[PDB]
């Protein structure tokens, strides 16, 4: 929370960083980005979507039952 210097304690850890003018802007943005987005999609839709298909069923069923209540008359 404070400034740098007195936060943690690390022993021997080596970090390499390349220059930004040295390397490309988008490293393989259409050969790894598509498998990464399909992987992150496949690892989340089974936990996100089965409530939303229930919401879609509730919306359609409520529309159909309101039309059921009003389309006899």
């Amino acid at each position: 929370g404070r400034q740098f210097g007195h936060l943690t304690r690390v022993r021997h850890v080596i970090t390499y960083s390349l220059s930004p003018f040295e390397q490309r802007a988008f490293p393989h943005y259409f050969s790894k980005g598509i498998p990464n987005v399909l992987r992150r999609t496949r690892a989340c839709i089974l936990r996100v979507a089965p409530p939303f298909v229930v919401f879609y069923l509730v919306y359609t069923w409520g529309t159909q039952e309101f039309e059921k209540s009003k389309r006899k008359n």
């Binding site: 400034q3 740098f4 210097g5 936060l7 943690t8 960083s17 220059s19 930004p20 003018f21 040295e22």
Partner: protein, 89 residues
């Protein structure tokens, strides 16, 4: 220029730095430069050449930074870059 003259002449004195100079001056250059020619190339240097060559080499390049030890407060590389050049800051 005074510090360069004093350091160079006080270094090339004795026997061992002299002979080191002979070795590294015949390998790298092809000839050992006598110090009168170094005096000539010092006399060919004013403030204009210094600031133009330093604007050619120091200013706006990509450094090699190498750190060892407790270096958490060492900046990330883009802070070294934003401190390298001037917008007159």
């Amino acid at each position: 220029k005074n510090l360069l003259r004093n350091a160079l002449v006080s270094h090339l004195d004795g026997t061992t730095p002299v002979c080191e100079d002979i070795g590294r001056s015949l390998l790298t250059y092809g000839r050992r430069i006598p110090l009168a020619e170094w005096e000539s190339r010092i006399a060919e240097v004013d403030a204009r050449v210094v600031r133009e060559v330093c604007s050619k080499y120091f200013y706006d390049q990509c450094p090699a930074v190498a750190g060892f030890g407790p270096i958490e407060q060492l900046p990330d590389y883009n802070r070294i870059r934003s401190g390298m050049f001037w917008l007159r800051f």
